[PDB]
């Protein structure tokens, strides 16, 4: 019997931190969310998990959030743990803007957050964040960027990533069709062309989605950030492969 | 394997037994108490058992005077009740000071049912094993009676009972109130009401009382008083014939 998984403050004889690993395990219980890089934009796609006939969902949101006017994130994992972060993630973002009078660079914001998640892993009386994040944004340093972070506090930059349920599947399909230059309207395509394949429901219904993207060009010498409405979805959804 | 040791752990069925056990201790008192309200008075009854030829009874009560209008009776250990009696006895003083007017029965009971809740959720101490019964003549409700318990509960009573004999003293009243079809005792003066309780209690216990087996207090138009030693013998006499 006797196991080394009773807390975060304890290394197993092999230097494992189980409590942290179990949190990393809480993610595979969340609705699938995707992020795909593009030569001109970034796409965020998620699949509402929770469901019931009488559940308001046309107004409020649950997986996609604006942190900065140039940065967005996909959530996956403990609902409450997600807001606690998202908020501080927003405050930090504004202090940078208030100090340097410039907007905060993506990696810096992702790193600051991963650094808090790191901390709840090393001090007693604390429980790590049961959250995962897909950061999609743009700064003048490195153009468009796609980042990911887990409960262990590590982060990384993908060209196309998925987190949540059936990550194996979703991850696999992408690894296959992703064309390294792929335009935006092809990523939004590939978004569903993956989410579809890895669902359960008899059919993939619009009211069960969340899309958002980041585009920019010569036109608006800056970035336009859009969070699709139930409408646009039910529509672009038909334009593809749904009656 | 110790749910019931910690005041903070929920059993698989959200129980918190430590709070539950708290109660049985409110019984090892072995004293019964019922309180009934007149039309401009309120009276509480309680037995005064003194099992020792050495204890001088003057210092043997379970009813104290919180403020010059509110009185209280407790169904528990003299140590714990003496505590509560003090806190509340002070909430009174401070309330007046901070608001310009004398604190109502109904309120004081909520400060306590609240106090013994925070007392119990933050786990800064063990819950007191007593039941508190607050009586007085409010200037916005006159005959008022509220009773709090260890679990941080309270409510209004048209006249209630407490002790190792809940139901008896209780049902006996439910049939007397089931008739008068009203929610209070009718009578112009306290004297007569008092007589009503003793009267309507011996009935449920099945025993005679003298000027030392009982103990009573009453509330008038703003002037709470404890019934004298010898004086309690009085109404005991008057109602020993009008049977």
């Amino acid at each position: 019997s006797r196991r080394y998984d009773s807390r975060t403050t304890i290394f197993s004889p092999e230097g494992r931190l189980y409590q942290v690993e179990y949190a990393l395990e809480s993610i595979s219980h969340a609705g699938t969310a995707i992020g795909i890089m593009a030569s001109d934009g970034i796409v965020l796609a998620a699949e509402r998990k929770v469901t019931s006939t009488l559940l308001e969902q046309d107004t409020s949101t649950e997986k996609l959030y604006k942190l900065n006017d140039k940065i967005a994130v996909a959530v996956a994992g403990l609902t409450a743990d997600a807001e606690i972060l998202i908020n501080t993630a927003r405050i930090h973002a504004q202090n940078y803007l208030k100090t340097y009078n410039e907007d905060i660079p993506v990696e810096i914001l992702v790193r600051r957050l991963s650094d808090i998640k790191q901390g709840y892993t090393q001090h007693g009386g604390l429980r790590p964040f049961g959250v995962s994040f897909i950061y999609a944004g743009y700064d003048d340093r490195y153009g468009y960027q796609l980042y990911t972070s887990n409960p262990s506090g590590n982060y990384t930059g993908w060209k196309a990533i998925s987190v949540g349920a059936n990550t194996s599947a979703a991850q696999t399909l992408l690894q296959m069709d992703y064309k390294d230059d792929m335009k935006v309207d092809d990523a939004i395509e590939l978004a569903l062309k993956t989410l579809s394949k890895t669902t359960d429901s008899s059919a993939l219904t619009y009211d069960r989605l969340e899309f958002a993207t980041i585009r920019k060009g010569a036109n608006d010498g800056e970035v336009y950030q859009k969070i699709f409405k139930p409408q646009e979805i039910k529509d672009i959804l038909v334009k593809t492969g749904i009656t | 394997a110790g749910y019931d040791r910690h005041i903070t752990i929920f059993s698989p069925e959200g129980r918190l037994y430590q709070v539950e056990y708290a109660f049985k201790a409110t019984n090892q008192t072995n004293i019964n108490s019922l309180a009934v309200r007149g039309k401009d008075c309120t009276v509480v009854i309680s037995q005064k058992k003194v099992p020792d030829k050495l204890l001088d009874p003057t210092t043997v009560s379970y009813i104290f005077c919180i403020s010059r209008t509110i009185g209280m009776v407790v169904n528990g250990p003299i140590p714990d009740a003496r505590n509560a009696a003090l806190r509340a006895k002070a909430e009174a003083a401070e309330f007046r000071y901070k608001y310009g007017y004398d604190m109502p029965c109904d309120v004081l009971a909520k400060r306590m049912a609240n106090l013994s809740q925070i007392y119990t959720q933050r786990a800064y101490m063990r819950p007191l094993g007593v039941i508190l019964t607050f009586v007085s003549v409010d200037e916005e409700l006159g005959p008022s009676i509220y009773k709090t318990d260890p679990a941080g509960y309270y409510v209004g009573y048209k006249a209630t009972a407490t002790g190792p004999k809940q139901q008896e003293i209780t049902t006996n009243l439910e049939n007397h109130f089931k008739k008068s079809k009203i929610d209070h005792i009718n009578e112009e003066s306290w004297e007569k009401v008092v007589e009503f309780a003793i009267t309507h209690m011996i009935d449920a216990l099945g025993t005679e009382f003298s000027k030392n087996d009982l103990e009573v207090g009453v509330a008038t138009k703003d002037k709470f008083f404890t019934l004298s030693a010898e004086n309690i013998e009085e109404r005991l006499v008057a109602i020993a014939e009008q049977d």
């Binding site: - | 005077c65 919180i66 403020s67 010059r68 003090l86 006895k89 002070a90 009174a92 003083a93 401070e94 007046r96 000071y97």
Partner: protein
């Protein structure tokens, strides 16, 4: 202004004008400078306004919390809770305060807490800007233990001159008699004390 409390046969009587000036303007001309901190314990405020007012407020508070657990408090007690506050804070307080109370046993006594929290128990005391004039009378016309009336016509003649020469003090007289009987309120209008 003009305040005082006198001990006699039954117990004690404390009285004082109604005038409260702010410069040469009269902010209120009918003030109740006789605060009650308890049934048989009263006091007459002097000095600053806002300060004295709040002290009482507190002193009351304590006593009300005292009886509530240590039974009804003496009079010597009250005058203690009073100085405690007037001493520790002699730096940001301007209080004249005279304390008086009737205790069943000790009859009725009088203590005067002046600037500094220096406490004193005397037959009777007189404080207020106007007391400076009735040091002649007050002393030369004082017999130990008077009657309920034999004295009320003392407070009346003291408070008479006080008003007569001290602008900062006037209005209507106000007495409160603390006795075995209880609390009694008196009020003797202008056309009267001037008459004398």
């Amino acid at each position: 202004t003009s305040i005082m409390a006198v001990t006699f046969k039954d117990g004690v009587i404390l009285g004082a004008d109604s005038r409260t000036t702010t410069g040469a303007y009269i902010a209120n001309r009918v003030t109740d400078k006789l605060t009650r901190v308890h049934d048989k314990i009263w006091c007459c405020r002097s000095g600053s306004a806002a300060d004295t007012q709040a002290i009482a407020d507190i002193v009351q508070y304590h006593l009300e919390l005292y009886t509530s657990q240590y039974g009804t408090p003496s009079t010597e007690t009250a005058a203690s809770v009073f100085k405690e506050l007037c001493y520790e804070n002699k730096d940001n307080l301007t209080a004249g305060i005279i304390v008086a109370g009737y205790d069943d046993k000790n009859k009725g006594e009088v203590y005067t807490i002046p600037l500094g929290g220096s406490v004193h128990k005397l037959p009777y005391a007189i404080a207020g800007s106007g007391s400076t004039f009735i040091y002649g009378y007050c002393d030369k016309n004082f017999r130990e233990n008077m009657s309920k009336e034999e004295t009320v016509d003392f407070i009346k003649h003291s408070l008479s001159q006080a008003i007569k020469w001290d602008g900062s003090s006037g209005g209507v007289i106000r007495m409160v008699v603390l006795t075995a009987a209880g609390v009694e309120r008196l009020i003797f209008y202008p056309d009267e004390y001037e008459q004398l």
